[PDB]
Design a protein around this ligand. Structure first.
Ligand SMILES: OC[C@H]1O[C@@H](O[C@H]2[C@H](O)[C@@H](O)[C@H](O[C@H]3[C@H](O)[C@@H](O)[C@H](O[C@H]4[C@H](O)[C@@H](O)[C@H](O[C@H]5[C@H](O)[C@@H](O)[C@H](O)O[C@@H]5CO)O[C@@H]4CO)O[C@@H]3CO)O[C@@H]2CO)[C@H](O)[C@@H](O)[C@@H]1O
Length: 406
């Protein structure tokens, strides 16, 4: 008897039991192997994974955020190197970038799922404001003009803010700036991933354009004090005409209808992020699976990773989590005929950009979270009138620290 233990982040409504249903055919086929998952929240996941990779008190397998895989893989003796042990030919090729440490051929993670952030909108709000969501969100400029028509629009008995986005207290602070920086023609690092570059003229233009949506009254200011979880539920309760969100919110909005009679899920559509002056770019995220080097059952752990990469396991976890499969053949399933999900798939395939997979990037994300949130403090005028020059100073200070980290 072999007991495999697994750490997962909260990818679905009931994470441990949802995972156990997906792995049931594996444990039915292998009666000598059991799978025991434990949930670790996103806020503590980096610290807990790092400590486990060093101390030795570790599960066999853990989920790792795709942007963290290089940081954990670069710790000596932390992870099993997976090169040659996983057959990558079945995978969407773009998903492998985060599985390797950049500048090396070393693969320490297996892609498990991907995600992107798309533009959710209220159909009833758009029709009341005279906004055509087929065309009026296509570019930055048209998107901004649509927000002006949507700001304060009354639908049913209440007025909606045009755009609702979080500002603080999770990893999504940098993720939500990423594609505005890309769309402006900027980037976070140079091609080598050795030097920070997000204080460039273009990167600041994207930061300026996005953050000043709130200065101009089009983004709900109180929501900038809150985290992603708070703003997703606010959108599901009808507070905003639009919001940029991951696909997982569809699970929660569907449940709200089944449990509370909340009809929000029937009133929304999704489109790709507006195109900026650089062309269209989108945040590309997701998670990998890794095997700890301290595992006493690496062969069985490898069999489980291969199962998670199988076509049907990819389809089933996508159905419950709404995350995107990383295996090409999963998209032959009729489920991916859904109009909402197809937008996330088309966006990430054509326009998804992932951060440089460098060891210092996980540490940099902690720095971004703090620093980019000060830009929202500036916009919200908690300490004096808003000044773009203060934003410039904040980004310059963040850039210097990340350069030391890199
Ligand atoms: O930078 C690191 C890493 O980030 C990845 O992106 C992450 C992102 O960091 C996370 O913030 C995000 O977390 C979301 C979860 O994926 C999603 O499952 C979760 O869904 C919640 C739901 O919001 C919540 O309502 C629900 O509570 C229910 C209860 O379970 C019931 O008991 C109760 O009665 O009713 C409620 C209603 O459903 O629970 C679920 C699960 O907890 O919401 C999170 C956002 O708030 O996930 C992103 C993707 O993983 C990025 O992809 C990586 O590349 C990167 O490395």
């Amino acid at each position: 008897s072999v007991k495999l233990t697994m750490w997962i982040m909260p990818n679905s409504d009931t994470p441990d039991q949802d995972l156990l249903k997906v792995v049931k055919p594996f444990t039915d086929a292998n009666p000598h192997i059991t799978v025991e998952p434990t949930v670790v929240d996103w806020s503590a996941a980096l610290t807990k994974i790092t400590a486990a990779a060093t101390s030795g008190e570790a599960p066999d397998i853990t989920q790792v955020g795709s942007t963290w895989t290089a940081a954990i893989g670069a710790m000596e003796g932390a992870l099993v190197e997976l090169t040659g042990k996983i057959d990558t030919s079945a995978f969407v090729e773009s998903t492998l970038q985060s599985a390797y440490i950049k500048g090396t051929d070393k693969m320490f993670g297996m892609p498990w799922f991907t995600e992107t952030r798309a533009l959710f909108y209220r159909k009833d709000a758009c029709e009341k404001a005279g906004v055509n969501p087929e065309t009026d969100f296509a570019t930055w400029d048209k998107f901004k003009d649509a927000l002006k028509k949507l700001n304060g629009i009354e639908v049913d008995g209440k007025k909606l803010a045009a755009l609702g986005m979080p500002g603080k207290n999770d990893w999504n602070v940098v993720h939500n700036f990423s594609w505005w920086i890309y769309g402006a023609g900027g980037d976070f690092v140079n091609e080598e991933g050795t030097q920070a570059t997000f204080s460039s003229e273009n990167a600041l233009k994207g930061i300026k354009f996005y953050s000043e949506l709130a200065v101009e009254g089009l983004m709900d200011e109180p929501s900038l004090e809150k985290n992603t979880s708070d703003i997703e539920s606010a959108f599901g309760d009808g507070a905003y005409a639009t919001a940029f969100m991951g696909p997982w919110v569809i699970s929660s909005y569907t449940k709200n209808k089944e449990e509370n009679g909340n009809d929000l899920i029937d009133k929304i559509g999704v489109t790709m992020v507006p195109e900026g002056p650089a062309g269209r770019y989108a945040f590309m995220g997701g998670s990998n699976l890794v095997i700890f080097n301290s595992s006493k059952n690496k062969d069985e752990a490898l069999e489980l990773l291969k199962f998670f990469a199988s076509k049907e396991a990819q389809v089933e976890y996508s159905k419950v989590s709404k995350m995107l499969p990383v295996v090409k053949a999963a998209y032959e399933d009729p489920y991916f005929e859904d109009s909402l999900m197809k937008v996330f798939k088309e966006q990430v395939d054509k326009y998804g950009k992932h951060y440089a997979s460098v060891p210092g990037w996980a540490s940099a994300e902690v720095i971004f979270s703090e620093g980019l949130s000060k830009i929202w403090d500036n916009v919200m005028e908690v300490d004096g009138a808003y000044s773009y020059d203060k934003t410039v100073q904040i980004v310059k200070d963040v850039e210097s620290q990340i350069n030391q980290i890199l």
